[PDB]
Structure 1
Amino acid sequence: IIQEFVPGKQVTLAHLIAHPGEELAKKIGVPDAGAIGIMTLTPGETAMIAGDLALKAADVHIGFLDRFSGALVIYGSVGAVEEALSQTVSGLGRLLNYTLCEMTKSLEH
């Protein structure tokens, strides 16, 4: 039989990369910051909503925001990126009842 589909509302991951470094940062065209934070979101348009939440949560900036894939990549100090990721995931839960993920981190060194 025909299967009917719609997008789910999900944060697939929300990951803090501490001190990614020059090589990695250049490859993805983001500043060589203290941290880069990456979120994968469904539907893809969520990246626009998440970008707003991140910017208002902490002193971070947007590396890139892609409505197609749903990727949101932010950068700034390690503490600011951690706070922005945490508040963005929690806000998507509170405002829009997203299925959430745990905040994960890759430490410096």
Structure 2
Amino acid sequence: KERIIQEFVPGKQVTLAHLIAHPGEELAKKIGVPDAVAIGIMTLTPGETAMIAGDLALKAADVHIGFLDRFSGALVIYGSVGAVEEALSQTVSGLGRLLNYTLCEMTKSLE
């Protein structure tokens, strides 16, 4: 085979930014967020980006932090479908702009 030594470092990337309107009570309960709200999901690298994204999203629309995970880089917000959608949209563009992140497409699940 081949042996390579590899100095690892975090990349800067928004891997997914997903909207889920009408998650349902079971999923909501599992996730640890309020029922009857839309939901925004982001994975971020490095993990500390979640605090930055948290700031952005809060300032972008009327959304709330379900939870913020500075280790995994997870961030979950909730609120109206419209608020969550804007918050997501704004936060992705803000990261590529302020920090020149690798970005992704915003995605959605409905029904």
Q: Would you say same fold, with TM above 0.5?
A: yes
1:64 aligns with 2:71: no
Deviation, 1:28, is 1.2
TM-score if structure 1 supplies the norm length?
0.96
Deviation, 1:37, is 0.4
> How many residues are paired up?
108
Deviation, 1:24, is 0.8
Matched residue, 1:53: 56
Residues 33 and 54 (structure 1), Cα distance of their counterparts in 2 relative to 1, 3 Å cut: farther
Residues 33 and 92 (structure 1), Cα distance of their counterparts in 2 relative to 1, 3 Å cut: farther
TM-score if structure 2 supplies the norm length?
0.94
Does the residue aligned with 1:40 lie in a helix, a strand or coil? strand
Runs of 4+ in 1 over 3 A off after TM superposition: none
Deviation, 1:87, is 0.2
Deviation, 1:33, is 3.4
Matched residue, 1:20: 23
Deviation, 1:34, is 2.7
Does the residue aligned with 1:59 lie in a helix, a strand or coil? coil
Deviation, 1:69, is 0.4
Gaps of 5+ in 1: none
**Using the alignment, how far apart are the partners of 2:36 and 2:106 within structure 1?**
19
Does the residue aligned with 2:92 lie in a helix, a strand or coil? helix
Is this contact kept in 2: 1:18–1:106, CA < 8 A? yes
**Using the alignment, how far apart are the partners of 2:59 and 2:34 within structure 1?**
20
Gaps of 5+ in 2: none
Is this contact kept in 2: 1:33–1:77, CA < 8 A? no
**Using the alignment, how far apart are the partners of 2:69 and 2:30 within structure 1?**
17
